[PDB]
Structures are given as C-alpha cells and as structure tokens.
C-alpha cells in the first residue's frame, strides 16, 4: 500500500480513472468540433476558438484528476479514448446542443462519482469534487443554455454570423 493512502477506497480510485477517460473524451469531442468549424465550408472563427478553448479545459479537468489520483496514493490507469460519435457537427446551434448534452452527461458522471466517495465517507474527495468540478459544471451548463436560446433567437444565415462575432468574444 502507497505511502499517502488514507481513507481512500479502491472504488473511489477506480471511479477517478474512468472520469479521467470521460474528460479526455469530451476534450476530444470539442477538438473535433473546433476544427470542424475551421472547415472552409463552415468557417466560423468564433466557434472554432470557443470549442478549442473548451477542449483545452477538458484536457485540464482530466489532468487535474490524474494529479489528484497521485495525491491520494491511487494509481492512474489509462484507457483508450474513443473518437467522438460524429465526424461533423452541423450548424452553430447543432454543436451547441451537442455540447449541452455532453456537459450534462459529464455532470451526471461527476454526481455519481460523488455518491461513490460519499458511501465511503471520503470527506476530502467530496469537497474536491464540489469545489473544482460541480460548481464549474453548473456554470457551464447555464452558459451553454443561454447560447442555445440566442442561437435560436438570431436564426440562420446572418444571425448565426453575428452571434459568431458578438457572443463568442
């Protein structure tokens, strides 16, 4: 048993490794979304940058978990990360819909991992999840919702173009 290990259950540890793979997967989806909007026949530079940034954020969420596995004495076991479920992503609105669903899946995965650590009274891993993940998920879910409502409000064509300029930095 590892030098740091203390109040750290095998299930919690196994649960962290899968969340790592899930975050790496979301990272990979947004990377695909990013370069999809870089296609010459889509060419929406705001969406390109917006999804590049979210890809980098998911990569960072993954590595924060990997680092946390080491802090508690756990051991990182990596898995294949699957190519995303689509090769392209439609309109700006379609991609934002897909992002919301993906974020709500990730949010549920977090809440399930929270229940895991709760059953094992992993008091510190609970506070880790609440502080560094659960709040930011709630924030991102509301932001993406707001983007959906506005992508619907502006319509297609010019309206999507403007949203690309004005709502995405």
Name residues contacting Fe ion, limited to 46-65 (CB under 5 A).
58, 61
Does the annotation list 61 as a binding residue?
Answer: yes
Find the binder of Fe ion among 13, 46, 113, 140 (CB under 5 A).
Answer: 140
| Secondary structure of residue 109 in the 3-state scheme | helix
CB neighbour class for 107 (10 Å; exposed up to 12, middle 13-18, buried from 19): middle
Does the annotation list 137 as a binding residue?
Answer: yes
CA distance 90 to 47: 12
Count the neighbouring beta carbons within 10 Å of the beta carbon of residue 5. 12
Does the annotation list 160 as a binding residue?
Answer: no
Binder of residue 159, out of a second copy, Fe ion, none (CB less than 5 to 8 A by kind): a second copy
CA distance 129 to 18: 14
Binding residues for Fe cation: 23, 58, 61, 103, 137
Provide the annotated binding site. 23, 54, 58, 61, 103, 127, 130, 136-137, 140
Residues near Fe ion (CB under 5 A) are 23, 58, 61, 106, 140
The binding site for Fe(3+) consists of 23, 54, 58, 61, 103, 127, 130, 136, 140
């Amino acid at each position: 048993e590892s030098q740091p290990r203390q109040n750290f259950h095998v299930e919690t540890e196994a649960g962290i490794n899968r969340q790592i793979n899930l975050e790496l997967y979301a990272c990979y989806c947004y990377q695909s979304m990013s370069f999809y909007f870089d296609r010459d026949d889509v060419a929406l530079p705001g969406f390109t940058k917006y999804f590049k940034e979210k890809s980098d954020e998911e990569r960072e969420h993954a590595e924060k978990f990997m680092k946390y596995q080491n802090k508690r004495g756990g051991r990182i076991v990596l898995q294949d990360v699957k190519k995303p479920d689509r090769d392209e992503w439609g309109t700006g609105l379609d991609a934002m819909q897909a992002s919301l669903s993906l974020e709500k899946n990730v949010n549920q995965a977090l809440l399930d991992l929270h229940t895991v650590g709760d059953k094992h009274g992993d008091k510190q891993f609970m506070d880790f999840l609440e502080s560094d993940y659960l709040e930011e998920q709630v924030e991102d879910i509301k932001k993406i919702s707001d983007h959906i409502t506005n992508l619907k409000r502006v319509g297609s064509g010019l309206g999507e173009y403007m949203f690309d300029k004005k709502s995405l930095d």
